[PDB]
Amino acid sequence: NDINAEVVSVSPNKLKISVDDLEEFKIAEEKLGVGSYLRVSDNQDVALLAIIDNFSIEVKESQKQKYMIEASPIGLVKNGKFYRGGDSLALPPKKVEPAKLDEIISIYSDS
Amino acid sequence: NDINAEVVSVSPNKLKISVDDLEEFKIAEEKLGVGSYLRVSDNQDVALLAIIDNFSIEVKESQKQKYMIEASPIGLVKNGKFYRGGDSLALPPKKVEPAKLDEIISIYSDS
Amino acid sequence: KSFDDQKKETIQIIKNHFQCEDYEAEHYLYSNAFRKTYDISCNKKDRRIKKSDFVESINKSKVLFNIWFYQYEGRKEYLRKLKESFIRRSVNTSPYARFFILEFQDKTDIKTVKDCIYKIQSNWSNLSKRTDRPYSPFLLFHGTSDANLYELKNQLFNEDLIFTDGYPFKGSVFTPKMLIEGFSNKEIHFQFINDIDDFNETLNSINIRKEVYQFYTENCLDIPSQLPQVNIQVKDFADIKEIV
Amino acid sequence: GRKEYLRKLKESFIRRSVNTSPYARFFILEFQDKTDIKTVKDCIYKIQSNWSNLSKRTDRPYSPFLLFHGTSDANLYELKNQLFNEDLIFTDGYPFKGSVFTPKMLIEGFSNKEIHFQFINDIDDFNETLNSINIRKEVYQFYTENCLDIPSQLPQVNIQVKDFADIKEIV
Amino acid sequence: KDCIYKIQSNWSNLSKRTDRPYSPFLLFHGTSDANLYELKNQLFNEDLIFTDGYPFKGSVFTPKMLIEGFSNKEIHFQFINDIDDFNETLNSINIRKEVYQFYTENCLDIPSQLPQVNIQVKDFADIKEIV
């Protein structure tokens, strides 16, 4: 695996995501930016799509790094079709990957 | 090593830098003040330039001195050329040294 | 024609032929084809040869030195030309197993060799106390006697540049796993591969991404082709410092 | 009897703990060609288990120093290679191939909790690490036929043993 | 079973305080496979969890299960089925090995590089008292 990001907290319009393990080091530069898009799901069929709002990567001596990502859910994908929704609840924990190109295209397309 | 500074936290527009050693005191007076330019990199080729916004050197009884520097990334140096619009992610920890005269000159000359 | 009037013509006839990128033709194929054109031209007897086997001679993985592109723009530009061609760097350097094979011969000073080791270890290692994934480069030196090589290793240890070679004691068989731990050890600055027999055994023990950076003067080795290699020929060993 | 022979030798020269104080303990064992490798290994493991304190609760740790003599380098290096594969981490002042004797590796390994004991190759490195250790040093000799010569300023015990296996329960 | 429980209780330390746990390795010989699997099935019923290197049905012998089960606090001991599984486990173990042999009539052949101790008992009931 290249990225192990995962939802640790759920708010009505806010998502807290922890990157437990980062291997590629290229995903963080482009696909984990300030306004990047994330896919939040436990399966490849139905997912929560969210835009990042904030992040923080803290390192100290003994403990592991704390890569916390702050995102806000914006919609919902069902078998490649995007449904825009302000509030759709994903029960944490949920496995997080960066959104693919066709998923971000689907945000502005299927509406 | 005259200076041993290191990024310990990364925000979208803020870096916290911990000065571990500070062997040469003259670096702190004229190169670690507010508004000074820092070179944030793991190599001598590609770097992140930052402006010192705030600092605090706390000292106590038995623990070591805590010198923390808050800096905001302002751009990117790619083997000589400065690139304005600093939003590229520097994964912490990163070795921090004061910026050279050529790097500060390249901030305004290259743009 | 003029010098500039033939630069923008030689590149495209091999650019479309091999279907590669710009650095893989201007810096990798143009440079190698210049000397093999010059080598048959500077020969005393055989001047004209057939170019049937010329296209496969220039496709070797080695980037050859070019003397005519050294005296033209100086050493401050040719090394700067090679530095952004195959020594591409990023803001974040990933924890990869980087191998630096440098050619050491008897005319090369130990101090000149010592200076490049300090340059390679500084750029290509992040031994930070706050890293969860520290990395250190692997170093291989060849073409020199063991007595001259052991003098370099002894001086590096007295200058507090702690390394590992897979030989923690006298009479030890070569253990790969000390070099793998020294990759992840923050107190071990780099790894010293003694020879080729200890080289190829270390490749099999590494599962993470592996990069090989070879810098030589005349003698180059057979790295396995699946690994990403950079083979750069230079005049003196001191030119290696300005590329890495 | 043999139990009485071991009991006398356990108390005449060797002490049970020597107050468990961090001291430069030197154990000189006479390795012969007739002595098999594994009975040396049991002696080394019993010396290391009894004569070191590498727990994390302590603040003043110590490890024993091991020296062997009377054997060739062929089976000496075989014993050192066998000990390293069993995670009995040692040092002998040769951190890399083609190294000079670096006695300060024996100094840091004495206080290192990750280095279980210190190996010493032969006499010349034994006298070189003697002048590098400043703290109190004691030498324990366990020999069958050849006894080594120890400097007279060090506290030394010399213990004759019938074979090599009876060294294990003495320490 | 009384001998196995005494070996597991005395010669293993799986307390949560330690960070260097260890479990014994158990090998049996001279009996059929029917009462070997009967003994293994009954020990697993009383939550004396062991591994023999066969994590699933139809598995090739995996010594790495015995590598992990030696240091696992939830795995009480290790089982070895017969001679061939014993020899390949020895090559997989890198740490110091000791062979403790208890027999009545027939004694197994052990490699000479290992520390071996041989006990000849009158019957199997004495083995629980000696260990």
PDB file of N, CA and C in Angstrom, chain D residues 50-130:
ATOM      1  N   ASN D  50      25.433 -14.402  33.830  1.00  0.00           N
ATOM      2  CA  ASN D  50      25.727 -14.142  35.235  1.00  0.00           C
ATOM      3  C   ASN D  50      26.452 -12.817  35.438  1.00  0.00           C
ATOM      4  N   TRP D  51      27.316 -12.431  34.500  1.00  0.00           N
ATOM      5  CA  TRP D  51      28.281 -11.365  34.736  1.00  0.00           C
ATOM      6  C   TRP D  51      27.992 -10.112  33.915  1.00  0.00           C
ATOM      7  N   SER D  52      26.719  -9.845  33.637  1.00  0.00           N
ATOM      8  CA  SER D  52      26.313  -8.596  33.011  1.00  0.00           C
ATOM      9  C   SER D  52      24.969  -8.177  33.581  1.00  0.00           C
ATOM     10  N   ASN D  53      24.686  -6.879  33.486  1.00  0.00           N
ATOM     11  CA  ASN D  53      23.411  -6.314  33.924  1.00  0.00           C
ATOM     12  C   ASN D  53      22.991  -5.352  32.817  1.00  0.00           C
ATOM     13  N   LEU D  54      22.178  -5.849  31.885  1.00  0.00           N
ATOM     14  CA  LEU D  54      21.697  -5.061  30.758  1.00  0.00           C
ATOM     15  C   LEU D  54      20.207  -4.754  30.863  1.00  0.00           C
ATOM     16  N   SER D  55      19.650  -4.811  32.068  1.00  0.00           N
ATOM     17  CA  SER D  55      18.259  -4.442  32.271  1.00  0.00           C
ATOM     18  C   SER D  55      18.085  -2.934  32.130  1.00  0.00           C
ATOM     19  N   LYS D  56      16.870  -2.523  31.771  1.00  0.00           N
ATOM     20  CA  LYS D  56      16.579  -1.104  31.614  1.00  0.00           C
ATOM     21  C   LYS D  56      16.394  -0.385  32.942  1.00  0.00           C
ATOM     22  N   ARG D  57      16.246  -1.120  34.047  1.00  0.00           N
ATOM     23  CA  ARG D  57      16.065  -0.478  35.344  1.00  0.00           C
ATOM     24  C   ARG D  57      17.363   0.127  35.861  1.00  0.00           C
ATOM     25  N   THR D  58      18.507  -0.409  35.446  1.00  0.00           N
ATOM     26  CA  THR D  58      19.776   0.091  35.943  1.00  0.00           C
ATOM     27  C   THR D  58      20.174   1.376  35.221  1.00  0.00           C
ATOM     28  N   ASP D  59      21.079   2.121  35.854  1.00  0.00           N
ATOM     29  CA  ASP D  59      21.695   3.288  35.247  1.00  0.00           C
ATOM     30  C   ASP D  59      23.199   3.142  35.085  1.00  0.00           C
ATOM     31  N   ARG D  60      23.790   2.073  35.613  1.00  0.00           N
ATOM     32  CA  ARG D  60      25.229   1.831  35.550  1.00  0.00           C
ATOM     33  C   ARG D  60      25.424   0.390  35.096  1.00  0.00           C
ATOM     34  N   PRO D  61      25.350   0.137  33.789  1.00  0.00           N
ATOM     35  CA  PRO D  61      25.408  -1.236  33.284  1.00  0.00           C
ATOM     36  C   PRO D  61      26.836  -1.708  33.039  1.00  0.00           C
ATOM     37  N   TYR D  62      26.964  -3.021  32.856  1.00  0.00           N
ATOM     38  CA  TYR D  62      28.260  -3.625  32.595  1.00  0.00           C
ATOM     39  C   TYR D  62      28.074  -4.909  31.799  1.00  0.00           C
ATOM     40  N   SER D  63      29.151  -5.326  31.140  1.00  0.00           N
ATOM     41  CA  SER D  63      29.207  -6.541  30.342  1.00  0.00           C
ATOM     42  C   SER D  63      30.580  -7.173  30.512  1.00  0.00           C
ATOM     43  N   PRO D  64      30.682  -8.495  30.410  1.00  0.00           N
ATOM     44  CA  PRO D  64      31.984  -9.146  30.570  1.00  0.00           C
ATOM     45  C   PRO D  64      32.846  -9.033  29.321  1.00  0.00           C
ATOM     46  N   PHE D  65      34.149  -9.196  29.534  1.00  0.00           N
ATOM     47  CA  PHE D  65      35.139  -9.249  28.466  1.00  0.00           C
ATOM     48  C   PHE D  65      35.610 -10.688  28.314  1.00  0.00           C
ATOM     49  N   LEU D  66      35.614 -11.187  27.080  1.00  0.00           N
ATOM     50  CA  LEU D  66      35.961 -12.574  26.794  1.00  0.00           C
ATOM     51  C   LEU D  66      37.238 -12.631  25.968  1.00  0.00           C
ATOM     52  N   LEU D  67      38.181 -13.466  26.399  1.00  0.00           N
ATOM     53  CA  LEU D  67      39.423 -13.712  25.679  1.00  0.00           C
ATOM     54  C   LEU D  67      39.674 -15.210  25.607  1.00  0.00           C
ATOM     55  N   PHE D  68      40.073 -15.680  24.430  1.00  0.00           N
ATOM     56  CA  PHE D  68      40.392 -17.081  24.207  1.00  0.00           C
ATOM     57  C   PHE D  68      41.813 -17.208  23.676  1.00  0.00           C
ATOM     58  N   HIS D  69      42.475 -18.297  24.055  1.00  0.00           N
ATOM     59  CA  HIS D  69      43.846 -18.538  23.636  1.00  0.00           C
ATOM     60  C   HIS D  69      44.077 -20.035  23.518  1.00  0.00           C
ATOM     61  N   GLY D  70      45.140 -20.393  22.803  1.00  0.00           N
ATOM     62  CA  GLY D  70      45.506 -21.778  22.606  1.00  0.00           C
ATOM     63  C   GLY D  70      44.854 -22.458  21.423  1.00  0.00           C
ATOM     64  N   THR D  71      43.967 -21.774  20.707  1.00  0.00           N
ATOM     65  CA  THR D  71      43.290 -22.338  19.551  1.00  0.00           C
ATOM     66  C   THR D  71      43.648 -21.547  18.300  1.00  0.00           C
ATOM     67  N   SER D  72      43.427 -22.174  17.149  1.00  0.00           N
ATOM     68  CA  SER D  72      43.677 -21.520  15.876  1.00  0.00           C
ATOM     69  C   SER D  72      42.578 -20.503  15.581  1.00  0.00           C
ATOM     70  N   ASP D  73      42.832 -19.655  14.583  1.00  0.00           N
ATOM     71  CA  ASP D  73      41.837 -18.667  14.183  1.00  0.00           C
ATOM     72  C   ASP D  73      40.703 -19.278  13.370  1.00  0.00           C
ATOM     73  N   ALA D  74      40.875 -20.504  12.867  1.00  0.00           N
ATOM     74  CA  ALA D  74      39.832 -21.134  12.062  1.00  0.00           C
ATOM     75  C   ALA D  74      38.600 -21.456  12.899  1.00  0.00           C
ATOM     76  N   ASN D  75      38.787 -22.131  14.033  1.00  0.00           N
ATOM     77  CA  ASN D  75      37.675 -22.427  14.926  1.00  0.00           C
ATOM     78  C   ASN D  75      37.369 -21.287  15.885  1.00  0.00           C
ATOM     79  N   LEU D  76      38.273 -20.316  16.022  1.00  0.00           N
ATOM     80  CA  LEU D  76      37.960 -19.123  16.801  1.00  0.00           C
ATOM     81  C   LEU D  76      36.947 -18.257  16.063  1.00  0.00           C
ATOM     82  N   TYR D  77      37.172 -18.030  14.765  1.00  0.00           N
ATOM     83  CA  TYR D  77      36.233 -17.246  13.966  1.00  0.00           C
ATOM     84  C   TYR D  77      34.917 -17.981  13.758  1.00  0.00           C
ATOM     85  N   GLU D  78      34.950 -19.316  13.738  1.00  0.00           N
ATOM     86  CA  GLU D  78      33.723 -20.095  13.616  1.00  0.00           C
ATOM     87  C   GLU D  78      32.844 -19.916  14.850  1.00  0.00           C
ATOM     88  N   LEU D  79      33.460 -19.868  16.034  1.00  0.00           N
ATOM     89  CA  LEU D  79      32.713 -19.630  17.265  1.00  0.00           C
ATOM     90  C   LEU D  79      32.100 -18.234  17.284  1.00  0.00           C
ATOM     91  N   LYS D  80      32.851 -17.227  16.826  1.00  0.00           N
ATOM     92  CA  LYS D  80      32.335 -15.861  16.781  1.00  0.00           C
ATOM     93  C   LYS D  80      31.199 -15.727  15.777  1.00  0.00           C
ATOM     94  N   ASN D  81      31.300 -16.417  14.639  1.00  0.00           N
ATOM     95  CA  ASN D  81      30.222 -16.391  13.656  1.00  0.00           C
ATOM     96  C   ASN D  81      28.982 -17.108  14.171  1.00  0.00           C
ATOM     97  N   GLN D  82      29.168 -18.182  14.940  1.00  0.00           N
ATOM     98  CA  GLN D  82      28.021 -18.894  15.492  1.00  0.00           C
ATOM     99  C   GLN D  82      27.316 -18.070  16.561  1.00  0.00           C
ATOM    100  N   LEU D  83      28.072 -17.322  17.369  1.00  0.00           N
ATOM    101  CA  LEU D  83      27.458 -16.495  18.405  1.00  0.00           C
ATOM    102  C   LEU D  83      26.656 -15.342  17.817  1.00  0.00           C
ATOM    103  N   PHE D  84      27.108 -14.782  16.693  1.00  0.00           N
ATOM    104  CA  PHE D  84      26.420 -13.637  16.105  1.00  0.00           C
ATOM    105  C   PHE D  84      25.077 -14.023  15.500  1.00  0.00           C
ATOM    106  N   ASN D  85      24.957 -15.244  14.973  1.00  0.00           N
ATOM    107  CA  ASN D  85      23.690 -15.685  14.403  1.00  0.00           C
ATOM    108  C   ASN D  85      22.637 -15.965  15.467  1.00  0.00           C
ATOM    109  N   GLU D  86      23.042 -16.152  16.722  1.00  0.00           N
ATOM    110  CA  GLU D  86      22.124 -16.408  17.822  1.00  0.00           C
ATOM    111  C   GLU D  86      21.832 -15.164  18.644  1.00  0.00           C
ATOM    112  N   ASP D  87      21.996 -13.983  18.047  1.00  0.00           N
ATOM    113  CA  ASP D  87      21.661 -12.685  18.633  1.00  0.00           C
ATOM    114  C   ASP D  87      22.426 -12.403  19.922  1.00  0.00           C
ATOM    115  N   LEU D  88      23.578 -13.048  20.115  1.00  0.00           N
ATOM    116  CA  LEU D  88      24.484 -12.705  21.209  1.00  0.00           C
ATOM    117  C   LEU D  88      25.468 -11.677  20.661  1.00  0.00           C
ATOM    118  N   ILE D  89      25.037 -10.420  20.697  1.00  0.00           N
ATOM    119  CA  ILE D  89      25.741  -9.344  20.013  1.00  0.00           C
ATOM    120  C   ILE D  89      26.983  -8.979  20.814  1.00  0.00           C
ATOM    121  N   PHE D  90      28.141  -9.006  20.160  1.00  0.00           N
ATOM    122  CA  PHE D  90      29.403  -8.674  20.803  1.00  0.00           C
ATOM    123  C   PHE D  90      30.167  -7.682  19.935  1.00  0.00           C
ATOM    124  N   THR D  91      31.344  -7.289  20.419  1.00  0.00           N
ATOM    125  CA  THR D  91      32.240  -6.418  19.679  1.00  0.00           C
ATOM    126  C   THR D  91      33.673  -6.781  20.037  1.00  0.00           C
ATOM    127  N   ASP D  92      34.601  -6.469  19.126  1.00  0.00           N
ATOM    128  CA  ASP D  92      36.007  -6.749  19.389  1.00  0.00           C
ATOM    129  C   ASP D  92      36.933  -5.649  18.886  1.00  0.00           C
ATOM    130  N   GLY D  93      36.438  -4.427  18.717  1.00  0.00           N
ATOM    131  CA  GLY D  93      37.280  -3.358  18.229  1.00  0.00           C
ATOM    132  C   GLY D  93      37.561  -3.388  16.746  1.00  0.00           C
ATOM    133  N   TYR D  94      36.851  -4.218  15.987  1.00  0.00           N
ATOM    134  CA  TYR D  94      36.988  -4.293  14.533  1.00  0.00           C
ATOM    135  C   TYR D  94      35.607  -4.096  13.927  1.00  0.00           C
ATOM    136  N   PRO D  95      35.130  -2.848  13.856  1.00  0.00           N
ATOM    137  CA  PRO D  95      33.760  -2.609  13.372  1.00  0.00           C
ATOM    138  C   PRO D  95      33.569  -2.879  11.891  1.00  0.00           C
ATOM    139  N   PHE D  96      34.637  -2.912  11.100  1.00  0.00           N
ATOM    140  CA  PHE D  96      34.538  -3.174   9.672  1.00  0.00           C
ATOM    141  C   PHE D  96      35.738  -4.001   9.235  1.00  0.00           C
ATOM    142  N   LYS D  97      35.678  -4.499   8.003  1.00  0.00           N
ATOM    143  CA  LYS D  97      36.774  -5.290   7.464  1.00  0.00           C
ATOM    144  C   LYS D  97      37.986  -4.411   7.187  1.00  0.00           C
ATOM    145  N   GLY D  98      39.167  -4.947   7.472  1.00  0.00           N
ATOM    146  CA  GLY D  98      40.395  -4.190   7.314  1.00  0.00           C
ATOM    147  C   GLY D  98      40.518  -3.025   8.270  1.00  0.00           C
ATOM    148  N   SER D  99      40.083  -3.205   9.511  1.00  0.00           N
ATOM    149  CA  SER D  99      40.129  -2.157  10.516  1.00  0.00           C
ATOM    150  C   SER D  99      41.274  -2.400  11.488  1.00  0.00           C
ATOM    151  N   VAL D 100      41.859  -1.304  11.970  1.00  0.00           N
ATOM    152  CA  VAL D 100      42.763  -1.402  13.104  1.00  0.00           C
ATOM    153  C   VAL D 100      41.958  -1.691  14.366  1.00  0.00           C
ATOM    154  N   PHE D 101      42.658  -2.124  15.409  1.00  0.00           N
ATOM    155  CA  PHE D 101      42.003  -2.345  16.691  1.00  0.00           C
ATOM    156  C   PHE D 101      41.555  -1.014  17.273  1.00  0.00           C
ATOM    157  N   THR D 102      40.243  -0.855  17.429  1.00  0.00           N
ATOM    158  CA  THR D 102      39.645   0.352  17.986  1.00  0.00           C
ATOM    159  C   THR D 102      39.144   0.006  19.378  1.00  0.00           C
ATOM    160  N   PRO D 103      39.946   0.223  20.425  1.00  0.00           N
ATOM    161  CA  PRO D 103      39.533  -0.210  21.768  1.00  0.00           C
ATOM    162  C   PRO D 103      38.329   0.540  22.313  1.00  0.00           C
ATOM    163  N   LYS D 104      37.973   1.693  21.744  1.00  0.00           N
ATOM    164  CA  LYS D 104      36.839   2.430  22.271  1.00  0.00           C
ATOM    165  C   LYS D 104      35.507   1.814  21.860  1.00  0.00           C
ATOM    166  N   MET D 105      35.485   0.948  20.844  1.00  0.00           N
ATOM    167  CA  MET D 105      34.336   0.063  20.653  1.00  0.00           C
ATOM    168  C   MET D 105      34.125  -0.880  21.830  1.00  0.00           C
ATOM    169  N   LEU D 106      35.208  -1.359  22.448  1.00  0.00           N
ATOM    170  CA  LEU D 106      35.076  -2.153  23.663  1.00  0.00           C
ATOM    171  C   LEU D 106      34.632  -1.298  24.842  1.00  0.00           C
ATOM    172  N   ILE D 107      34.912   0.009  24.806  1.00  0.00           N
ATOM    173  CA  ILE D 107      34.516   0.894  25.900  1.00  0.00           C
ATOM    174  C   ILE D 107      33.017   1.179  25.835  1.00  0.00           C
ATOM    175  N   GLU D 108      32.504   1.521  24.644  1.00  0.00           N
ATOM    176  CA  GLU D 108      31.068   1.767  24.514  1.00  0.00           C
ATOM    177  C   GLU D 108      30.257   0.487  24.644  1.00  0.00           C
ATOM    178  N   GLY D 109      30.793  -0.644  24.181  1.00  0.00           N
ATOM    179  CA  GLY D 109      30.095  -1.910  24.330  1.00  0.00           C
ATOM    180  C   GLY D 109      29.983  -2.380  25.763  1.00  0.00           C
ATOM    181  N   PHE D 110      30.901  -1.944  26.627  1.00  0.00           N
ATOM    182  CA  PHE D 110      30.805  -2.251  28.050  1.00  0.00           C
ATOM    183  C   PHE D 110      29.572  -1.608  28.673  1.00  0.00           C
ATOM    184  N   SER D 111      29.277  -0.366  28.295  1.00  0.00           N
ATOM    185  CA  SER D 111      28.121   0.355  28.809  1.00  0.00           C
ATOM    186  C   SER D 111      26.886   0.210  27.929  1.00  0.00           C
ATOM    187  N   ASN D 112      27.000  -0.452  26.780  1.00  0.00           N
ATOM    188  CA  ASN D 112      25.858  -0.640  25.896  1.00  0.00           C
ATOM    189  C   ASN D 112      25.025  -1.823  26.365  1.00  0.00           C
ATOM    190  N   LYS D 113      23.717  -1.607  26.501  1.00  0.00           N
ATOM    191  CA  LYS D 113      22.816  -2.685  26.879  1.00  0.00           C
ATOM    192  C   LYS D 113      22.478  -3.598  25.709  1.00  0.00           C
ATOM    193  N   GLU D 114      22.722  -3.155  24.478  1.00  0.00           N
ATOM    194  CA  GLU D 114      22.473  -3.969  23.297  1.00  0.00           C
ATOM    195  C   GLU D 114      23.654  -4.852  22.921  1.00  0.00           C
ATOM    196  N   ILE D 115      24.837  -4.588  23.466  1.00  0.00           N
ATOM    197  CA  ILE D 115      26.010  -5.426  23.254  1.00  0.00           C
ATOM    198  C   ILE D 115      26.184  -6.285  24.498  1.00  0.00           C
ATOM    199  N   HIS D 116      26.079  -7.603  24.322  1.00  0.00           N
ATOM    200  CA  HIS D 116      25.976  -8.508  25.462  1.00  0.00           C
ATOM    201  C   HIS D 116      27.320  -8.733  26.145  1.00  0.00           C
ATOM    202  N   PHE D 117      28.397  -8.838  25.372  1.00  0.00           N
ATOM    203  CA  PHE D 117      29.728  -9.007  25.935  1.00  0.00           C
ATOM    204  C   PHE D 117      30.741  -8.455  24.945  1.00  0.00           C
ATOM    205  N   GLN D 118      32.005  -8.447  25.358  1.00  0.00           N
ATOM    206  CA  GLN D 118      33.093  -7.933  24.535  1.00  0.00           C
ATOM    207  C   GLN D 118      34.062  -9.063  24.235  1.00  0.00           C
ATOM    208  N   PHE D 119      34.323  -9.288  22.955  1.00  0.00           N
ATOM    209  CA  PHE D 119      35.303 -10.266  22.524  1.00  0.00           C
ATOM    210  C   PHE D 119      36.670  -9.607  22.406  1.00  0.00           C
ATOM    211  N   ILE D 120      37.712 -10.374  22.709  1.00  0.00           N
ATOM    212  CA  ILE D 120      39.087  -9.927  22.529  1.00  0.00           C
ATOM    213  C   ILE D 120      39.819 -11.017  21.761  1.00  0.00           C
ATOM    214  N   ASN D 121      40.442 -10.639  20.642  1.00  0.00           N
ATOM    215  CA  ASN D 121      40.964 -11.633  19.707  1.00  0.00           C
ATOM    216  C   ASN D 121      42.178 -12.361  20.273  1.00  0.00           C
ATOM    217  N   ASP D 122      43.153 -11.623  20.792  1.00  0.00           N
ATOM    218  CA  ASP D 122      44.389 -12.243  21.259  1.00  0.00           C
ATOM    219  C   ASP D 122      45.063 -11.313  22.269  1.00  0.00           C
ATOM    220  N   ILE D 123      46.342 -11.581  22.551  1.00  0.00           N
ATOM    221  CA  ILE D 123      47.071 -10.892  23.613  1.00  0.00           C
ATOM    222  C   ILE D 123      47.250  -9.410  23.296  1.00  0.00           C
ATOM    223  N   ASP D 124      47.613  -9.086  22.049  1.00  0.00           N
ATOM    224  CA  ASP D 124      47.974  -7.711  21.702  1.00  0.00           C
ATOM    225  C   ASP D 124      46.790  -6.760  21.839  1.00  0.00           C
ATOM    226  N   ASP D 125      45.592  -7.208  21.471  1.00  0.00           N
ATOM    227  CA  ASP D 125      44.399  -6.414  21.730  1.00  0.00           C
ATOM    228  C   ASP D 125      43.983  -6.446  23.194  1.00  0.00           C
ATOM    229  N   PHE D 126      44.363  -7.493  23.934  1.00  0.00           N
ATOM    230  CA  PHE D 126      44.043  -7.559  25.357  1.00  0.00           C
ATOM    231  C   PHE D 126      44.805  -6.505  26.151  1.00  0.00           C
ATOM    232  N   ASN D 127      46.094  -6.315  25.857  1.00  0.00           N
ATOM    233  CA  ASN D 127      46.847  -5.265  26.537  1.00  0.00           C
ATOM    234  C   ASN D 127      46.464  -3.880  26.033  1.00  0.00           C
ATOM    235  N   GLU D 128      45.960  -3.783  24.801  1.00  0.00           N
ATOM    236  CA  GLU D 128      45.570  -2.484  24.268  1.00  0.00           C
ATOM    237  C   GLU D 128      44.276  -1.988  24.901  1.00  0.00           C
ATOM    238  N   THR D 129      43.336  -2.893  25.182  1.00  0.00           N
ATOM    239  CA  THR D 129      42.117  -2.492  25.875  1.00  0.00           C
ATOM    240  C   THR D 129      42.312  -2.388  27.380  1.00  0.00           C
ATOM    241  N   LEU D 130      43.403  -2.942  27.913  1.00  0.00           N
ATOM    242  CA  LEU D 130      43.706  -2.781  29.331  1.00  0.00           C
ATOM    243  C   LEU D 130      44.055  -1.335  29.656  1.00  0.00           C
TER     244      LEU D 130
END
